[PDB]
Structure formats: structure tokens, C-alpha cells
Amino acid sequence: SKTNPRLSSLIADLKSAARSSGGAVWGDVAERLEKPRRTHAEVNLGRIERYAQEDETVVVPGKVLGSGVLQKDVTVAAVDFSGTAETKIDQVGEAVSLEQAIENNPEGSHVRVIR
């Protein structure tokens, strides 16, 4: 039972996109978000720099934090970003909300899940 109304809406929107469009990621990210908070992703920057590649969206099924350096020109999509993360990402790429990524790419194509 998620108490946050915004997280509840996001999960509903991730499901609607997984069913209507050809997305097999948005409903998979919805399943991890429905799981307990401790099982959610708490990813730092040094991990996105290690496994992500350009022109391929990075989906984090949790929150992105600011430890480490990011050089790659990647578009990171997450539930939330720490103040420092969003700042460090926008310097060398784009920090996009998961709510936007659904409207931009409802089919969930060319996307890497990083946790």
C-alpha cells in the first residue's frame, strides 16, 4: 500500500503504457515499483557511466544519486533524482522523469534497465 499519490499515478501510467503500446519494460518497472521501498533502486552515477551507452535511454526503477563521475551523453529516466544527480547529469546529458519517458517512448524501445 503506497501512500504517495504521485507514485500510485506513475505506476498506473506505466501499466497503461505497457498494455496499450508494445512496452514490456514499463510494466516490468511497474512491478518493481509495487514491490517494497527497500527493493527499489538507489543507483549512483559511477554505475551509469560503467554500463550505459549513447542513444539508448537508461531506466532506473528507483532513484539516482550523485556519487561518482558521468561523462557519457546519456538520457537517464528515473522515479526521482537527488539534487546533485540531476545537476551532474544535465551537465553531460539529460535527466528525464519516468513520467515523461512514457510519453516520449510508449513502446519502450532502445532502453537499458540499470540498478
Partner 1 sequence: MQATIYDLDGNTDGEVDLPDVFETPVRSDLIGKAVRAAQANRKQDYGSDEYAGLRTPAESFGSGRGQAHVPKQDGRARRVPQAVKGRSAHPPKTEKDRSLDLNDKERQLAVRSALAATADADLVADRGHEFDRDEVPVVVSDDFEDLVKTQEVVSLLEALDVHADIDRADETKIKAGQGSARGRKYRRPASILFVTSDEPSTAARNLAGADVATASEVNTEDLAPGGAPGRLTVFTESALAEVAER
Partner 2 sequence: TSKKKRQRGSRTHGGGSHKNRRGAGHRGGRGDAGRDKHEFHNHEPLGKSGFKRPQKVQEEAATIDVREIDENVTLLAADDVAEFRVDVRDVVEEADDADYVKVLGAGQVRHELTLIADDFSEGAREKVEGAGGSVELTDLGEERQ
- Minimal CA–CA distance to 58: which of 35, 81, 36? 81
Q: Is 19 strand, coil or helix?
A: helix
Site membership for partner 1, residue 4 (CB under 8 A): yes
Query: Residue 7 or 113: which CB sits closer to partner 1?
Result: 7
CB 90 → RNA: shortest distance, Å? Answer: 14
Enter the C-alpha cell of residue 16.
497503461
CB 1 → partner 1: shortest distance, Å? Answer: 11
Say how far apart CA 37 and CA 33 lie, in whole Å.
Answer: 8
Residues 67-96, mask of contacts with partner 1 (x by CB under 8 A):
------------------------------
5, 38, 54, 83: which one binds partner 1 (CB under 8 A): 5
- Return the number of other C-beta atoms located less than 10 Å from residue 60's C-beta: 26
- Residues whose CB is less than 8 angstroms from the CB of residue 46 and which lie 6 or more positions away in sequence, other chains included: 67, 68, 69, 70
Site membership for partner 2, residue 69 (CB under 8 A): yes
Q: DSSP character for 54?
A: T
Residues within the interface to RNA (CB under 7 A)? 1-4, 7, 23-25, 28, 36-38, 42, 44, 46-47, 49-51, 53, 56, 63, 65-69, 80, 82-85, 107-115
